[PDB]
Symmetry: C2
Subunit: 238 residues, 2 copies
């Protein structure tokens, strides 16, 4: 039997792991799993509901982590310190296709730059890839659409690979890239009405920056009023 | 007393006129008002509910219209034939600032070409949205507004113009004035060209946003492109002064 820690701020992926544990006897016989959300999460209520304790991974002492065979990061909002990843086997469930558009919001960047998008489970380092797979971007899709395919794919990757990774039955491999910063994200959000480009470029920018009800793209008008912008695309008219 | 014919395919305008009649003794004491929708209206059900009969003004005979002092057109989907307008006093309630962007969807065109937008009540002559103007008023286009936002402001203004002027017009107390210029007319084909997006069009983001907001009008999408595989993708935009 192994003890495992999952550090996640993502309701869907945590629920999914929890549901696999409950529906798969192979998990329940082999594992004790503790689940924690990040101390920086501003809205953890639904994770609390789900069955999770707060952890602060930046200040957690290695001394309190000795029982864990490994730690899984599934969209943990805090970066793990170097000392955690060098002293504990840490595996990341990552919503991008390493090594393309590493960093922030891989699907936003892939919409714009056409590099592959997908999901990757890999070892953390200051990492080697156990499994990954690509998803497609279709012409009518926004950031939220692609992210939703990505989450779907992560669940598939978990379901088919995670127990094996935990049991050492799947060995990783160093990536054959590029990285995008939060500041790169924020530069994109600040639209320039005077930008000359193709309608295609400008629709892609709006679609990259459309993600649910929270708008990101904005301009300032003539009067310095802030106006947020999003786009809707559909294969139906109505 | 006078007998009046209102031909309209717009619920909001017909319901407004009905409500003023019901609420203003000056109307009910002077006027008998018949209301009709266009035979071409594919979905008149709400209008039927409202209390209205079908009319085909394109084939209506002039002899059946002798009782009417005047005919009011309020977003009638059929165009009045020349013989009707030249032989009956016909008054149009138009959702544009004549003579600018006469014809179809004035606010779409105004978002694109920046000509004034507003509402106009004018005499109908044999040209579209071209006769002498009784009254009209401008509305503004703000940076976050789509076709439907400006349309709703236009409708609100048509209501105020009717409320403040329509009895006077009927009673020959307000004389109209020539439009300031011939102006410019947009067809349905002009609108449908706009709808077909050219993804290679080279422009400022402002031009592109203006085109998308001109074409955004409620849940029915107008603007489209075809993608790599010839799939048709409709496009609308949302602009707002709040994030969420
Ligand atoms: Cl002239």
């Amino acid at each position: 039997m192994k003890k495992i820690l999952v550090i996640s701020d993502n309701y869907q992926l945590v629920s999914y792991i929890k549901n696999l544990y409950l529906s798969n006897e192979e998990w329940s016989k082999e594992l004790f799993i503790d689940y924690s959300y990040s101390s920086i999460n501003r809205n953890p209520q639904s994770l609390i509901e789900l069955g999770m304790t707060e952890i602060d991974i930046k200040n957690k002492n290695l001394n309190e982590l000795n029982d864990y065979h490994l730690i899984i990061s599934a969209h943990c909002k805090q970066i793990f310190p170097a000392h955690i990843v060098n002293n504990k086997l840490c595996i990341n469930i990552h919503p991008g296709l390493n090594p393309y558009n590493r960093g922030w919001f891989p699907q936003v960047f892939s919409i714009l730059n056409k590099k592959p998008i997908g999901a990757t489970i890999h070892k953390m380092d200051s990492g080697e890839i156990y499994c990954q797979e690509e998803v497609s971007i279709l012409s009518h899709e926004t950031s939220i659409d692609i992210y939703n395919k990505v989450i779907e794919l992560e669940k598939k990757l978990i379901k088919n690979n995670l127990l094996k990774i935990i049991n050492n039955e799947l060995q990783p491999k160093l990536p054959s890239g590029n990285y995008n910063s939060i500041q790169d994200f924020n530069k994109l959000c600040k639209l320039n009405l005077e930008d000359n480009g193709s309608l295609r470029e400008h629709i892609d920018l709006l679609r990259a920056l459309t993600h649910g009800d929270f708008k990101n793209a904005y301009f300032y008008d003539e009067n310095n009023t802030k106006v947020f912008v999003k786009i809707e695309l559909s294969l139906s008219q109505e």
